[PDB]
Structures are given as C-alpha cells and as structure tokens.
Design a protein around this ligand. Sequence first.
Ligand SMILES: Nc1ncnc2c1ncn2[C@@H]1O[C@H](COP(=O)(O)OP(=O)(O)O)[C@@H](O)[C@H]1O
Ligand SMILES: Nc1ncnc2c1ncn2[C@@H]1O[C@H](COP(=O)(O)OP(=O)(O)O)[C@@H](O)[C@H]1O
Ligand SMILES: Cc1cn([C@H]2C[C@H](O)[C@@H](COP(=O)(O)O)O2)c(=O)[nH]c1=O
Ligand SMILES: Cc1cn([C@H]2C[C@H](O)[C@@H](COP(=O)(O)O)O2)c(=O)[nH]c1=O
Ligand SMILES: [Ca+2]
Ligand SMILES: [Ca+2]
Ligand SMILES: [Ca+2]
Ligand SMILES: [Ca+2]
Ligand SMILES: [Ca+2]
Ligand SMILES: [Ca+2]
Ligand SMILES: [Ca+2]
Ligand SMILES: [Ca+2]
Ligand SMILES: [Ca+2]
Ligand SMILES: [Ca+2]
Ligand SMILES: [Ca+2]
Ligand SMILES: [Ca+2]
Ligand SMILES: [Ca+2]
Ligand SMILES: [Ca+2]
Ligand SMILES: [Ca+2]
Ligand SMILES: [Cl-]
Ligand SMILES: [Cl-]
Ligand SMILES: [Cl-]
Lengths: 186, 185
Amino acid sequence: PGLFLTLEGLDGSGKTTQARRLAAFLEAQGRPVLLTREPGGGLPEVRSLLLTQELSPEAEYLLFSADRAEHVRKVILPGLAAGKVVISDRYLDSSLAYQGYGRGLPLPWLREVAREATRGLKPRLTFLLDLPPEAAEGLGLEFFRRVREGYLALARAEPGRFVVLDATLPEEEIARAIQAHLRPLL
Amino acid sequence: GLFLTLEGLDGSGKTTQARRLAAFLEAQGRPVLLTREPGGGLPEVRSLLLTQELSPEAEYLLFSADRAEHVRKVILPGLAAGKVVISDRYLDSSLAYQGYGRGLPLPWLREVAREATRGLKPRLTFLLDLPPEAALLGLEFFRRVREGYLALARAEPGRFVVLDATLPEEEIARAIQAHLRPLLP
Ligand SMILES: Nc1ncnc2c1ncn2[C@@H]1O[C@H](COP(=O)(O)OP(=O)(O)O)[C@@H](O)[C@H]1O
Ligand SMILES: Nc1ncnc2c1ncn2[C@@H]1O[C@H](COP(=O)(O)OP(=O)(O)O)[C@@H](O)[C@H]1O
Ligand SMILES: Cc1cn([C@H]2C[C@H](O)[C@@H](COP(=O)(O)O)O2)c(=O)[nH]c1=O
Ligand SMILES: Cc1cn([C@H]2C[C@H](O)[C@@H](COP(=O)(O)O)O2)c(=O)[nH]c1=O
Ligand SMILES: [Ca+2]
Ligand SMILES: [Ca+2]
Ligand SMILES: [Ca+2]
Ligand SMILES: [Ca+2]
Ligand SMILES: [Ca+2]
Ligand SMILES: [Ca+2]
Ligand SMILES: [Ca+2]
Ligand SMILES: [Ca+2]
Ligand SMILES: [Ca+2]
Ligand SMILES: [Ca+2]
Ligand SMILES: [Ca+2]
Ligand SMILES: [Ca+2]
Ligand SMILES: [Ca+2]
Ligand SMILES: [Ca+2]
Ligand SMILES: [Ca+2]
Ligand SMILES: [Cl-]
Ligand SMILES: [Cl-]
Ligand SMILES: [Cl-]
C-alpha cells in the first residue's frame, strides 16, 4: 500500500518548494501524506556530522547512508504500510548524483551499500527539477556541473521512474506538471 | 610502518594491553601511534552513539564513516611516517558486534568496509578472549559477540592471536611481545 514519491535536483532547484506544494495538494484531495526529507529524516544529528571539515567522500556517503537506513526503517516503510503517500525531499538518487558523479565514488559500491540501507525500496516516481549548474566541502561550479549531468544520466537510465522538469519554469507550472504525472496513480 | 590491532569484549583488557604494547615499543626506540575506535576519525560519532539507539544498519554505517576518516586522517599517515600504529578496536569490532551480535550479513559488512578502509588490514590482531561474565540484549548478545570474535579468529589464524584475557596483565603483555618480536629488529 501507499505511494512513495521523491524530489531531486541541485541545491536551489525548487525541491522543497514543490515537495511542500505537492503535500498540501494531496492533503486537500483527502489523501494521507507524510512529508519527509534527507539528510536528517532518519537521524537528525547527521546534519552536524555532514558539516565536519575536510570529510572524505567515503565518510560523507556513509553518513548519508546511516541517515537513509534509519529514515527508511523508521519513517518511510511504516508510512507506506499505513497507506500514506510518502514524499521525500531528496532520497538515494541524491547520493548517486552528489557522491557518485560529483565526488567520483564508484556507483556499484554506492548501490551495494544502499541495498541494505534502503532494503531495495525505490520511489514509484521521482521528480527531477533540472537546474543550470550556475544557478545552484567544495561545492563549486565544476562539481555542480558533474552533479547536474549525473542526475540527467540517472534519469535516462530509469526513464519510467524519473520525470525531468525544467526548474526555471514558474512554480505553478511545475506544480501543475507534477500533479498531471500523478493523476493516473491517484 | 606496521599496523596492529586489539580486539575483544568491553573489559577484556584492550586499552591496558595497547598501553603496555606502546610502552614496550617506546623502550625499543620504535615510533608508535596509539589510536582507537570509535572516535579516532569522527569523535562526534562516538558521543552520538553513546546516547542514541539505532537500527544495526545505521549503527554500522556510522562506525564505518568514523572508520573511513580514521584510516585516512590518522592510520595511513601514521604508517607512512614509519610508525607502529596500534588501534584499540578496528573493523573486526563491527564484524563481531554488528555482524555476529546484531545479525548483519558479513559479506555486506565487508563490501562496505572495502572502500571505507581502502583494504587496509592489520598485520596482527590480538584478541583478548573471555566469557562476558568475566569482563572486568542481556548476556546472549555478548555471547554472540564473543563467539563471533572466535569465529573470525579461526577463519584467519595467520592474523589473529587469541589470548586468555583472564591471565595477569604482565603475562599477556609478554605473550603479545613474543608474537610481535619476529616482525621487528
Ligand atoms: N520555479 C521557481 N522559479 C524561481 N524561483 C524559485 C522556483 N521555485 C523555488 N524558487 C525559489 O528558489 C529558492 C530555492 O528554492 P528551494 O525550494 O529552497 O530549492 P531546493 O529545496 O531545491 O534547494 C527559493 O528562494 C525559492 O523561493
Ligand atoms: N590481565 C588483567 N588482569 C586483571 N585486571 C585487568 C587485566 N587487564 C586489565 N585489567 C583491568 O580491567 C579493567 C578493564 O580493562 P581495559 O583495558 O579497560 O579493557 P577494555 O579496554 O577491553 O574495556 C581495568 O580496570 C583494568 O585495570
Ligand atoms: C540526501 C543527500 C544530500 N546531499 C547534499 C545536498 C545538499 O548540498 C546537502 C543538504 O541537502 P538539503 O539542502 O536538500 O537539505 O546535502 C548529498 O550530497 N547527498 C545526499 O545523499
Ligand atoms: C569500533 C566499534 C565499537 N563497537 C562498540 C563496542 C563498544 O561497546 C563500544 C565502544 O565504546 P567505547 O567508545 O566506550 O570504547 O562500541 C561496535 O559495536 N562496533 C564497532 O565497530
Ligand atoms: Ca537539477
Ligand atoms: Ca530544500
Ligand atoms: Ca508540487
Ligand atoms: Ca551539532
Ligand atoms: Ca541522507
Ligand atoms: Ca545510501
Ligand atoms: Ca530519489
Ligand atoms: Ca564535505
Ligand atoms: Ca495552479
Ligand atoms: Ca578500552
Ligand atoms: Ca568506528
Ligand atoms: Ca567499516
Ligand atoms: Ca563482566
Ligand atoms: Ca555468534
Ligand atoms: Ca565461535
Ligand atoms: Cl524506469
Ligand atoms: Cl519541463
Ligand atoms: Cl593465552
């Protein structure tokens, strides 16, 4: 039961904006909704750990995964079991784009760590707000270009799961597009 | 450099023997670095785990994040400077506690560890073995851990040295020294 949805995209791409608009939209339709986010939905203190200066990308990813493991077990799976629409503002694809394409960590390793962390849980749809890198720990332009292109590659590899939207479109037009993709599921 | 670890249950004498081992090495003029897990990489992970109860998976992943920093910032640089690096707990702790204790599958733990450690393995690991009731869930968890350590040791008899932790401090230290002497001048 339940429906698992996520929002993805670069910093400043509108994920939180659209995630919250979606939650209220579905709540107004009488649907039970659980709005959550990463990092911090499993282990809130992970945000502190993530700020540590000079963190290796390996330790960085392992922190995101620790949070993700707790998040899936304690928040997402129980919410879905109750028949809720669970919306996560970021999920695993964030690590793949940032720690994989951005930091250069090997994707298969990321995936293998993820397999137990997530228990294989994948969103039914993922809305990728595609933002030019200039518009967006070493998070400079070259990193954001890698991450931006990584997300687009992840979307090409799973074109049924990913819905790619132009993040520069007006907020209301993006929301209407998100709603239209959901209409057949809800 | 030379990488050595100590392993065993809480109260098995790890920190004590790690201290005596460093002292022995100092007496021979051998540069030594004493370190520990958890907290050698990310001190905040230690303090957080002190007061927080998590899923085994999340717990292991924090120990691994800490371990990843520990290897990179402390252990590998120590070894590159030619030090004998002693870690009071390392990967075998996760295998015994999170693997055998909490039930996580070992091959998954090891694939996570593979990038976290950069494949860095101790040359020797001294396991200070004793029943949980002799250490200086209830007891069933700690028995799973103690048996897990012994499982690990019998799978890698070239790396593990298993000592009777109930012996007097000095005898154990001399036992450790005996095992180590072939690896030094
Ligand atoms: N479609 C949009 N066009 C222009 N600005 C937007 C749009 N959506 C959100 N914003 C604004 O951009 C900033 C970043 O939005 P936010 O939702 O925080 O992005 P993210 O959560 O992906 O970092 C906010 O100031 C927000 O008001
Ligand atoms: N061989 C031994 N015999 C008796 N007491 C010991 C011995 N080794 C250590 N101790 C004492 O036992 C306690 C636990 O030792 P410690 O080195 O802290 O173990 P761990 O680091 O494994 O928890 C300490 O109070 C220490 O003084
Ligand atoms: C969830 C997640 C976030 N991030 C980054 C994106 C942001 O720069 C930062 C905080 O995310 P937030 O701004 O969406 O809360 O964490 C990763 O690098 N990997 C991840 O897995
Ligand atoms: C290093 C490590 C320790 N532990 C446990 C064993 C001890 O109970 C505790 C360490 O406590 P300490 O920080 O007071 O020595 O952490 C694990 O469960 N897994 C690990 O990987
Ligand atoms: Ca984007
Ligand atoms: Ca946001
Ligand atoms: Ca929306
Ligand atoms: Ca803090
Ligand atoms: Ca996370
Ligand atoms: Ca993960
Ligand atoms: Ca996602
Ligand atoms: Ca960083
Ligand atoms: Ca509208
Ligand atoms: Ca100790
Ligand atoms: Ca650790
Ligand atoms: Ca590890
Ligand atoms: Ca005891
Ligand atoms: Ca066991
Ligand atoms: Ca055994
Ligand atoms: Cl797909
Ligand atoms: Cl679009
Ligand atoms: Cl012995």
